[PDB]
Design a protein around this ligand. Sequence first.
Ligand SMILES: [Ca+2]
Ligand SMILES: [Ca+2]
Ligand SMILES: [Ca+2]
Ligand SMILES: [Ca+2]
Lengths: 189, 60, 189, 212, 212, 34
Amino acid sequence: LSSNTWPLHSVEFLADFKRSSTSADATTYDCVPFNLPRVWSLARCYSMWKPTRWDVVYLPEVSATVAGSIEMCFLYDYADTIPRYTGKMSRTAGFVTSSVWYGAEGCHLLSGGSARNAVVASMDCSRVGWKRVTSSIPSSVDPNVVNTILPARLAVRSSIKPTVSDTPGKLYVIASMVLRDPVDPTLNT
Amino acid sequence: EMCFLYDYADTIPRYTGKMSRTAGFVTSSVWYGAEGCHLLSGGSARNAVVASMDCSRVGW
Amino acid sequence: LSSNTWPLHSVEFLADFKRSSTSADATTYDCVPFNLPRVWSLARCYSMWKPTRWDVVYLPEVSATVAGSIEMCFLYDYADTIPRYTGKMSRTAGFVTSSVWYGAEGCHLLSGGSARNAVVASMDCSRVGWKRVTSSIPSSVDPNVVNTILPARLAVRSSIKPTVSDTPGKLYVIASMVLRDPVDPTLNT
Amino acid sequence: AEPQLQRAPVAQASRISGTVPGPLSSNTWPLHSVEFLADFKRSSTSADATTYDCVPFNLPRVWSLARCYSMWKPTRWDVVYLPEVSATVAGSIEMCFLYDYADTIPRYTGKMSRTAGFVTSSVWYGAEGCHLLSGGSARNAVVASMDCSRVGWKRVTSSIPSSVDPNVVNTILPARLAVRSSIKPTVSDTPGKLYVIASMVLRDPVDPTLNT
Amino acid sequence: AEPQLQRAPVAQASRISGTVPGPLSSNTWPLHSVEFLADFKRSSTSADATTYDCVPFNLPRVWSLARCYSMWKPTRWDVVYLPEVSATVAGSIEMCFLYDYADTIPRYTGKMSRTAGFVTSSVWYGAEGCHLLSGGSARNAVVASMDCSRVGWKRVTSSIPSSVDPNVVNTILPARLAVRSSIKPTVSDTPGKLYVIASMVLRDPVDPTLNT
Amino acid sequence: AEPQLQRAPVAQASRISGTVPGPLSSNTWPLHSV
Ligand SMILES: [Ca+2]
Ligand SMILES: [Ca+2]
Ligand SMILES: [Ca+2]
Ligand SMILES: [Ca+2]
């Protein structure tokens, strides 16, 4: 309800699903407001935030004959190593893989929501507490310090290496959060 | 990519990020959504690519 | 509650109450999100807004010996002439006046409630419809065009011409609104 | 019957939803176990208590399972002392828990007694604690229980950042068990054993090889 | 449940059968309406009757709907005269229908009377015709009915080829209403109003912008 | 009713199992004659 607490449901483009022709490493995305321009514009006006939903849906835009799959999972510890292959991915939390060309049915999740044959990677938000809204990540520090601000990292991996670097789809985030103690957007770091 | 602009003064999105941040946003494989043909007659928007405009609160 | 809609309660510094040593005219403030940095940072992420509250509190910060008083009222039509004197101010909506050094007791209004000894000028928000959020105002246009985006103007006046321009207190806005259709903050005009 | 005229699709989505099935694939996994913690070492020169980090990687068997999950939350953690000395042995064992890495390790009985979870026992008392490790009956056991209520979800690590601000260590270390000897024998000895009866909940799987 | 492994087809036919659904998409559409036709203008110099082409595009509201169809067939077409003058006004209104564009417009009572659908009335008679425009009761109304039986399906046009053989005009013009004043006032005047009570059937839709 | 939106497959197997039907297609055929 109220008393220094504003609930928020947003949908925003997160990033392009990029496939490397050389690296087998997954690309990680920090599940924090400053990574979503519009949501950041809102969140930066508050000192604290608490994710309630945070779901990343993959929407493809390539031929149905393209080869490969997209793999997704969430990493809840910054200290944890970024998956360099399918098993590592298949073994971790929120795992989900689907042919790179599949997914369009997920557009219904964006507008409204009837996730059926949607390719989503849901983050474990239950038991995720009030974190401090920051404008950056102290990567140069002990992973434990980072954990303080990073609820989780989305790991996205190309099941295979295309002959040329490419992007067969896009990742959109459907976030739901509550914001708490106001701050001047310009002083929020 | 489809979305609705409710203020003529607002700038037309020039890219995916901008489009996604706009009301009524929707995207689809250009080859997805043929089932939308049945929408034009009966119904079943289950597998259709539709961009709905916020009509509630729109006055006379 | 949902689907392009969430209430927003905010408090922000509006402007310094400036007393002209030569002019008797009232200063005018446009009651729109873009005139409140933080609130603007939020409202700009939406296409439409609807004021639910909008109250401006006068909080003094001068000696109990300063003479003169502050006068406030709201103008709901851009075409309407700005009050030149006390009688005029007194005859317009939301009119309130108070000795320039009184009003400190209204600080709990900023956090909590009890406008019991406050110097507030409340805008009539009931029956104020959805207005498009704008980054500016067409000041050289027909007032009716302006009225489209301007719910009202706060008119502040000094009941006295001090020997030298001075600012006896400040005006703080206590706004409560609902925003509606998402829009990229950078594309909002 | 008639041979079926299969229609060949341009492709066919290959999809898997959720962590691949197996022993530790559930979102969460509760685990209870008895784990040998350490020997109750009695220094003959130092009066300082010995510290033990109450974290999964310090429990060999539990760690095997725990490293497959990224988050854990202690629910029980109880350390039982088992005497292996005669009733002629003088001395006492002192145990308590330290919930802030920045806090100083007690160097004497008074300090130990003023600390949470404090407990003392004749070094030759508590053999009945053997039955605790299996069935139950902590009636006559020497146990040091860690305050687990209010302990939140901690990240599972394979190490402790020791030369770092105690505050960052606290983010991973729910508590430390402090074990002290009430007296200094003429020569270092080992009056008994310390076994941990841990109970925890693991959450959010992760490839073990990535877990650090 | 299990994620469904969708089979992607080389394509997927996009098909629509029949005029897209909406207000005027039916093969045929019947429409009844009251439409103001014109003022009963009484010339003070000419004895010639005034002609009115009984075609859809001459009925503003009806035309709005009619232009969405390519074919129409009149079913009723009745023109009611409404007096707006006192019972002291001399003169009569004469009405009849001309079913051949090549036919000469009557210049006098005798000619008018010899023409189909003929009718005359004291210019101040027929106010009860007001009730016709709504409910009914043509008992005391001055009405000129057009012979609609036997009128076939006509193409809907937005114009009349006037400087063309009357025979080609006939293909589009079911009939003309001829209105005449039995007398010449000292100066042109307007004793009443002419309202049409049309009933027609529209058939075979067409984009309005193409309809001409 | 609604026109059915046929899904076109890359192909479609053309298959026949067993000797094409007719008078002498059976695995065996008994015959008696003068
Ligand atoms: Ca901050
Ligand atoms: Ca705008
Ligand atoms: Ca870890
Ligand atoms: Ca036509």
